[PDB]
Design a protein around this ligand. Structure first.
Ligand SMILES: *C(=O)/C=C\c1ccc(O)cc1
Length: 125
């Protein structure tokens, strides 16, 4: 598998070399969003945690369609600020409970290296 540690300092540089196939070899869930919150990448580990079929969610809006429970100042509010500020690095716990068993996770959001893309990393706690 891919040996990348959750919350690593240079994770945006390392994941810059990973294709969709490589992302699926991570020890934790990984989502790539555009500045509007549309889903660009969604790896296997994330799909194990949420039950979503990765291919099926790419293209939908994370905050509108897929994960309305994140539509809150505590999640989406922080996202919208990072995008507007052009910088984002934050780590917090949250509960995912839409159409699923309530699951506690640690979330790390961080701006990608290139363009207008942002990472959302998730692991169980
Ligand atoms: C609330 O809706 C939280 C999270 C979440 C994450 C991924 C997917 O697919 C659904 C929901």
């Amino acid at each position: 598998m891919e040996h990348v540690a959750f919350g690593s300092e240079d994770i945006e540089n390392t994941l810059a070399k990973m294709d969709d196939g490589q992302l699926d070899g991570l020890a934790f869930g990984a989502i790539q969003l555009d500045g509007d919150g549309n889903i660009l990448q969604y790896n296997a580990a994330q799909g194990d945690i949420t039950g979503r079929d990765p291919k099926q969610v790419i293209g939908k809006n994370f905050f509108k369609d897929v994960a309305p429970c994140t539509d809150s100042p505590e999640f989406y509010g922080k996202f919208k600020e990072g995008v507007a500020s052009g910088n984002l690095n934050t780590m917090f716990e949250y509960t995912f409970d839409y159409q699923m068993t309530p699951t506690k996770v640690k979330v790390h959001m961080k701006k990608a290296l290139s363009g207008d893309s942002y990472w959302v990393f998730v692991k169980r706690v």
